[PDB]
Amino acid sequence: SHMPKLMLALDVLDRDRALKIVEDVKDYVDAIKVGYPLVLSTGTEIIKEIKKLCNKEVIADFKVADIPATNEKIAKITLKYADGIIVHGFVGEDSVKAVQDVAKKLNKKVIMVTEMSHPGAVQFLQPIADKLSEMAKKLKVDAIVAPSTRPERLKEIKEIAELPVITPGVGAQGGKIEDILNILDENDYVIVGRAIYQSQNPKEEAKKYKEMLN
Amino acid sequence: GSHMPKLMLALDVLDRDRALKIVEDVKDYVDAIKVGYPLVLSTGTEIIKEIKKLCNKEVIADFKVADIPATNEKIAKITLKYADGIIVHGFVGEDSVKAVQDVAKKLNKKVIMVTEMSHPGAVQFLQPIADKLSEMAKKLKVDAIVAPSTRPERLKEIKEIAELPVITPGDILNILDENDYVIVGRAIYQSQNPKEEAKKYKEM
Ligand SMILES: [Cl-]
C-alpha cells in the first residue's frame, strides 16, 4: 500500500556488468541511480543504453555543484537520457533553479541533496541541513536525498521538506533498516546498492529487497 | 613573487572536434587547459586523453567533486588517469577532500579546492564560510585554490589566509605571481584566431 519504491544504486565501473545487472533486476527495481564513476568512462551513452533496456526511471547522481550557466549545460546533456538529476543545494538557489528550468521543459526531475552521512558532512553541510530542506520546499524540487542513519532525524526531514525522500533502505552490512518503512510512503524511495550489484544473482537479491518493503 | 602568472584556458565548448582544434591552435601559448563536465560527458574521458596528447600541457578537470569519500576516490581515479589535476569542493568536508588527495598523491597529480564562488547563489551558504574553507585548504595542503577575482582586495585576503596558489578569472595581476593561474575562456575559444588571442593574453 504505502510501500516505498526500490532504487538500485548501480555503482559498478564496467558498462557490460552494469548492463547485465539492469537486465537481471528490471522486474523488481523501480528506479536505477547511476553516478560519475560509471558514466565517466564512456559518457552518457550508457544512460541511453540502460534506457533501451529496463523501461524504469534512471536518475543521475551527479551532485551538480556549479554556477548557473554550467549547471544548465550539465543538466541539458544529462537529462537527454536520464529521467532525473541530483543536485547540491549548498551552491545556492540560482544554481538549483538553473537545473530546474532545464528539467521542467523536459518533464524531468530535479532532486536536491539536503543532508549527507559521511563524517566530513558534520563540519559545514550538517549545520545547514534544515536550511537545505527548507530551500528544497521553497523551490519545489521533485525530491530530496537524505540519510536514514537516524529514523527520528528522517522524520524531521520529511516534516520540514514535505517532499519525497530518497534514502538508504539498508545499513552498511546490507540488512534492513528498522523503523523507517513506517515513515516512508509510495512516493519515497529506498536505495540498495552493493548487496544487489555485488551478487552473482542480482535478480534474487533485488527480489528479496523489494519484498522487504512488504 | 613578482613574475607573471600562468595562463589557463577554460575550454568551455561542447563539440569534440572544435575542442581539439582549439587546443592544437593554442598549445604553445597556454600553460594549462581546464575542462568541465559538459565537454567530458558526451564521450567520456577519452577526450582528456586526446587533449593531453595534443597540447602536452597541464590538463585540469573542473569537476567540482562533491561526494562521500568512497565515491570521490572513484571519480579521482578515473579522472586523473588522463588529467593532471582535479577541482574539488571543500564544503562537503575534510575526508571527502582527503580521499581525492590520497589518489592524487600516488600519481604526483594535483588537487585544487573551491573555497569561494562568485555567482549570486554563493552568498547563501558558501560565502559565510569562505575564510574557513581557505583555512581548510591550507590545513590539508591542497595544491591550489579556486577563487574569484571580482574584488582584487578580497583575492589578496584569500591568498594571505591560504598561502596557496590561486586559479582565478582574468589590476588583478599585481596580486598574483608565477605560482598563480589566470583563467581565460570565451575571449580565446570563441575567437576567429584563438592562437592569436592566446598569444596576446600570454603577453599581458
Ligand atoms: Cl547495499
Side-chain angles (χ1 to χ4, degrees):
Chain A
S1 184
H2 290 328
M3 313 170 286
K5 291 180 274 189
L6 173 62
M7 179 181 293
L8 172 62
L10 185 56
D11 297 329
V12 298
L13 298 176
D14 176 83
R15 76 181 291 286
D16 293 342
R17 178 66 179 163
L19 289 177
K20 179 187 290 302
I21 292 161
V22 170
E23 171 78 3
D24 213 35
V25 310
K26 60 182 185 177
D27 294 330
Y28 293 104
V29 304
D30 298 293
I32 299 173
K33 185 175 74 67
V34 295
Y36 279 130
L38 175 60
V39 177
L40 270 174
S41 169
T42 59
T44 56
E45 65 85 18
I46 190 55
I47 304 178
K48 177 177 69 169
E49 290 299 314
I50 285 173
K51 286 294 288 193
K52 289 184 193 162
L53 231 59
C54 71
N55 209 21
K56 301 285 175 79
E57 179 174 42
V58 174
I59 301 309
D61 190 358
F62 284 0
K63 297 307 200 296
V64 187
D66 219 306
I67 66 180
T70 297
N71 273 22
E72 170 184 8
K73 293 175 188 171
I74 293 172
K76 287 188 185 179
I77 189 158
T78 298
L79 295 175
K80 182 170 181 53
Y81 303 117
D83 299 298
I85 187 175
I86 292 168
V87 310
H88 273 293
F90 77 79
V91 299
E93 274 189 28
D94 57 353
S95 292
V96 174
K97 282 181 164 295
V99 180
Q100 288 185 288
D101 288 353
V102 170
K104 284 185 180 176
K105 295 185 182 305
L106 301 171
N107 191 26
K108 290 178 169 184
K109 297 180 181 176
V110 179
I111 296 157
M112 181 191 304
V113 179
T114 65
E115 194 158 335
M116 294 182 75
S117 63
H118 63 294
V122 79
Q123 186 168 12
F124 304 118
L125 273 170
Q126 196 70 26
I128 68 166
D130 285 354
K131 292 299 181 175
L132 287 175
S133 55
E134 294 159 18
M135 190 178 45
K137 175 167 60 189
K138 176 187 178 181
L139 298 178
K140 299 178 193 294
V141 296
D142 298 88
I144 58 174
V145 169
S148 54
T149 57
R150 302 187 279 142
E152 299 88 350
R153 175 64 189 163
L154 185 57
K155 184 173 183 289
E156 292 173 331
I157 296 163
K158 276 181 61 79
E159 293 187 354
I160 294 163
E162 303 186 348
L163 290 167
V165 183
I166 297 160
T167 194
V170 300
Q173 299 77 27
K176 185 183 181 185
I177 294 179
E178 204 45 83
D179 302 315
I180 67 167
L181 296 188
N182 45 42
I183 299 185
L184 304 171
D185 66 18
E186 76 272 17
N187 293 305
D188 299 319
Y189 301 74
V190 288
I191 304 170
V192 177
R194 54 182 298 200
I196 295 172
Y197 67 68
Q198 291 179 338
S199 177
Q200 290 309 295
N201 302 108
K203 183 184 291 171
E204 300 171 19
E205 303 312 310
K207 177 179 188 289
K208 172 180 70 190
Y209 286 112
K210 179 71 158 172
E211 290 173 0
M212 182 185 75
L213 309 179
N214 299 336
Chain B
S2 62
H3 297 2
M4 54 187 300
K6 291 171 276 186
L7 176 60
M8 182 177 293
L9 173 64
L11 186 63
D12 294 337
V13 303
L14 295 181
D15 181 71
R16 188 177 182 278
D17 285 350
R18 183 182 179 210
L20 297 175
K21 176 181 182 176
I22 293 168
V23 167
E24 183 133 33
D25 203 31
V26 308
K27 58 175 170 63
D28 295 328
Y29 300 112
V30 304
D31 301 291
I33 296 176
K34 185 170 72 63
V35 297
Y37 276 133
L39 176 59
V40 177
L41 277 178
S42 55
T43 59
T45 57
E46 64 84 21
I47 190 56
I48 307 176
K49 180 176 64 172
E50 302 291 332
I51 283 169
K52 176 63 173 180
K53 193 181 309 181
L54 285 168
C55 70
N56 202 17
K57 297 287 177 78
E58 195 176 21
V59 178
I60 303 304
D62 188 356
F63 284 180
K64 301 297 198 301
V65 190
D67 219 310
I68 64 177
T71 297
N72 276 20
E73 173 181 17
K74 289 179 183 65
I75 295 173
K77 291 180 183 175
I78 298 162
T79 296
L80 295 174
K81 184 184 177 187
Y82 302 123
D84 297 293
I86 186 173
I87 291 169
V88 307
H89 271 294
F91 198 103
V92 301
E94 293 199 355
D95 56 356
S96 296
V97 175
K98 180 169 189 304
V100 177
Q101 291 186 282
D102 291 344
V103 172
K105 292 187 184 180
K106 295 183 180 296
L107 305 170
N108 285 324
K109 290 184 168 173
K110 297 184 178 172
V111 181
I112 296 155
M113 180 191 294
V114 182
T115 63
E116 200 151 336
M117 299 183 74
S118 64
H119 62 294
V123 165
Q124 199 168 357
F125 304 114
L126 278 161
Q127 200 65 38
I129 65 150
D131 283 8
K132 283 155 199 302
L133 285 179
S134 285
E135 291 162 19
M136 168 184 292
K138 177 168 57 181
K139 178 189 168 183
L140 290 182
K141 305 179 132 66
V142 300
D143 296 281
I145 59 183
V146 161
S149 56
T150 51
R151 272 177 299 115
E153 291 80 355
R154 174 56 189 170
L155 189 66
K156 187 171 180 293
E157 297 172 352
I158 297 167
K159 288 193 67 168
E160 293 179 354
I161 294 171
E163 290 181 6
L164 289 176
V166 302
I167 298 164
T168 200
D171 49 349
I172 285 130
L173 306 179
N174 298 345
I175 281 142
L176 304 183
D177 62 20
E178 51 266 42
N179 294 314
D180 298 321
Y181 300 77
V182 295
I183 308 174
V184 177
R186 185 178 161 229
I188 293 170
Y189 69 67
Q190 202 64 36
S191 177
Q192 297 300 323
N193 199 325
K195 181 181 176 300
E196 181 180 294
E197 285 301 313
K199 183 169 174 55
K200 173 165 66 188
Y201 274 95
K202 183 74 172 172
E203 301 230 47
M204 299 180 200

